[PDB]
Amino acid sequence: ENLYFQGMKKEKVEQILAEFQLQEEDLKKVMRRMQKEMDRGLRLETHEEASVKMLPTYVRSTPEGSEVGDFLSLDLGGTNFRVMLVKVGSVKTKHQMYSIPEDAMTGTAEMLFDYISECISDFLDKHQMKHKKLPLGFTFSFPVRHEDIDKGILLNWTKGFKASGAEGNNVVGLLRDAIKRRGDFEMDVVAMVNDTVATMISCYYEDHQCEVGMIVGTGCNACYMEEMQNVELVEGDEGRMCVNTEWGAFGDSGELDEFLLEYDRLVDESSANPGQQLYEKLIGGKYMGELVRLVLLRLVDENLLFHGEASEQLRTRGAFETRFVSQVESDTGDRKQIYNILSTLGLRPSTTDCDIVRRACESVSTRAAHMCSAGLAGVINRMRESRSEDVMRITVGVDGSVYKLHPSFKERFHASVRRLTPSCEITFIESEEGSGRGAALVSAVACK
Ligand SMILES: Cc1cnc(NC(=O)c2cc(Oc3cnc(C(=O)N(C)C)nc3)c3cc(C)oc3c2)cn1
Ligand SMILES: OC[C@H]1O[C@H](O)[C@H](O)[C@@H](O)[C@@H]1O
Ligand code: NA
Structure with missing residues (x-):
């Protein structure tokens, strides 16, 4: 065992996991790039080349x-x-x-x-x-x-x-x-x-203030009520029309390149749509668990997890399900939930292994919450500007298993949206x- 060695192992895990970190300035950059792509998608001149389709x-x-x-x-x-x-x-x-x-x-x-x-x-x-x-x-x-x-x-x-x-x-x-x-x-x-x-x-x-729809489930997307004058693809400048951002395709023209890690390239390369939906690939439930599986294999390779051995189930595609990320993060501190998930994946986890798996899970889900927040803040910020409102009060309607069932995603995401949306009063509502x-x-x- 050895408490000094267990600690040295967790310190190397952390150094690797630190790559998932996004500073507030990185989120503002992502946000400004999202906003730039949204302007492009809406205009007749750049629409065909825009990665964010802003579909009427x-x-x-x-x-x-x-x-x-x-x-x-x-x-x-x-x-x-x-x-x-x-x-x-x-x-x-x-x-x-x-x-x-x-x-x-x-x-x-x-x-x-x-x-x-x-x-x-x-x-x-x-x-x-x-x-x-x-x-x-x-x-x-x-x-x-x-x-x-x-x-x-x-x-x-x-x-x-x-x-x-x-x-x-x-x-x-x-x-x-x-x-x-x-x-x-x-x-x-x-x-x-x-x-x-x-x-x-x-x-x-249920709430007439609701003018934004957001999905954080298998995929990740958003729609909002745009001014008809900004919707160049539809003749007319009176009232508002709902625009489907299709923001999952943000980064498909290289807009997220500096933030894409090795795990992101592997998930993308082994996906049915490589080079497509790259921002969605950072957040969506179809990818989240697979990203955790990849990080765990990297930690097994550095001899930091599971005695450097990965089971057949750990080397199986889609074996670390997204629900397990949610379930690992639900764990009360006793490690019983983490342990059972790992045992079912044919592993013999120590207390240290359980804690490391917990950390890899939080690093991936916190990145997803943060990337997702830059997108929502960009949409909300753009709306505040278009409506020329000093303080904009809006309700966002949200559906999907990641936002609904993940134990800390929602909280990390709301707090990050709030930081990026000053002069915005956002109410989040879950759809029944x-x-x-x-x-x-x-x-x-x-x-x-
Ligand atoms: C051709 C066309 C063009 N635009 C629309 N447009 C629409 O259908 C429509 C319905 C809406 O929501 C509603 C939800 N429920 C009810 C309701 O209480 N019902 C009993 C239905 N009404 C409206 C909203 C809300 C926003 C911000 O924009 C909307 C557009 C529909 N059809
Ligand atoms: O289901 C969530 C989202 O997933 C993908 O991004 C789809 O392309 C988009 O249409 C949808 O809204
Ligand atoms: Na228009």
Whole structure:
């Protein structure tokens, strides 16, 4: 054992972990670069080259007028596929979750939308309604270049999705064609929204100050209410339109280069979309645990962890799940949670190993919270400027397992947003069934 040696080991761990550190000035730099990229995406002259796409959603600030009745909602791209029946009068919901097979997410668009339509049929039978033709709202968690609220092309798949025959095509069309091939129900697709947009809309229902939507789950993204005069891609300068930032692609033109560590390059190189969604790759739950796994292998290689031996499970891709980062950070101090996770990964951890794993986890999750804060602060700061407000009071609607379930992420992120947003009063609100509800609310408003 030896307490002097255990300590020397932790000091070398720290020297390696220090590379994850971001100073307040680094965050301001990241923030200013994000803001610079947001200006670029919005303008007709730089839009095509901008990494931050600032996509117009065609979701407009509207005086009101919501339709009443039953609305169907689809949710694709997060954790599984969701069908929701929404009753607008007051709003009450009925919903079901379906696990997407790998062969559908990685095969053809036809296989993907065929399975989606099968699930819709199953929801409609379970609620005895495959006869009623309802207005349908679609939450599709991928970058889309809209022509309208109900017409838009998939730019590229993100988060490991790889279905062929989808990119370059109208997503509403793919969906509608799949419903027709099946021929056992009818739906009128009225709106297609990003998950950030759906979250902002359902959160707004509860707090009219909500004009920003943020997702920190499998992926990381944000939307906000932009002035129509700043939305150059849409003719008109009156009122506001929701803009899908698609901020996950920040750094794809080299904007984050000085901050990318070896672990970031490896995660990127072994991903389905290399060289893409690099800022998301620093924060998203699809990558967080993999980043911790990589740091642990580096520490095993320096003979600082697990007697310099890594098990087959520790050398398995995606074995250190993001939920384990959350669970390791939940540990009360006894080390029991850390121990069980490590034992299940075929390791024989000492008390010191448990503490080192704890440290690698906090170094990755604190970096994610800090990188994510520079992005939110850039959006909020830009809004304060555009609205020419001395003190801007805004509510941010947030969804996703990383922000929701990670034990300290949310706190580190809020504190870092606050530091970067002086003269801003930000209220953070967590969405209760965010996406589904949101896509149906936009549908009720659109269905006039
Ligand atoms: C074509 C088109 C263009 N823009 C929109 N625009 C919209 O649908 C719409 C709905 C919104 O949120 C709502 C949430 N719930 C309700 C509600 O209480 N209902 C009963 C639905 N209403 C609005 C918000 C909130 C902001 C900041 O912008 C919005 C736009 C919709 N369709
Ligand atoms: O789901 C979270 C986010 O993940 C990825 O960044 C997607 O490209 C974006 O559309 C989505 O909002
Ligand atoms: Na405009």
